Design a protein around this ligand. Structure first.
Ligand code: NAG
Lengths: 101, 51
């Protein structure tokens, strides 16, 4: 169980590294998934050995640029049917007004 | 040999990782050491193996 604060996730990661646990099913809102993945990266917990699975339904929204060359596997799930072009147009129109925030 | 530009470092590091070479003596001004270290981190070559 990840503790109350996120950035205190380091002890868990140390324990997992010592125990040689090479498969994980994270479970949290993608916002906290990003933090735990960054903590993993700075822990050297990110190579072609480990393989993460994210029960979050927004794994696609993460920034993946710093991670994709590492050779790590991150299988997620995505319900938002973005293959249809109509959906893509709607999403783009939505982004056209999200950037006020 | 490192290539001319900094971020060209990646193809070199790919072959390093493929050949299973965990002992490296770098030789460059630290201004390049920082860049090559970031590349090595994004390439995921920063574990307890490499020295
Ligand atoms: C991890 O990803 C790489 C590239 O897709 C793949 O070749 C490998 O089979 C995957 N599994 C492991 C070893 O984690």
């Amino acid at each position: 169980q990840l503790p109350a604060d996120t950035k205190d996730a380091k002890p868990l990661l140390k324990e997992m590294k010592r125990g040689k646990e090479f498969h994980v099913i994270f479970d949290c809102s993608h916002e906290m998934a990003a933090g735990i993945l960054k903590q993993a990266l700075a822990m050297g917990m990110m190579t072609e050995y480990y393989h993460y699975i994210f029960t979050t339904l927004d794994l696609f929204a993460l920034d993946v640029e710093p991670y994709r060359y590492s050779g790590v596997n991150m299988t997620g799930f995505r319900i938002l049917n973005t293959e249809n072009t109509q959906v893509s147009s709607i999403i783009e129109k939505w982004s056209m007004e999200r950037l006020q925030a």
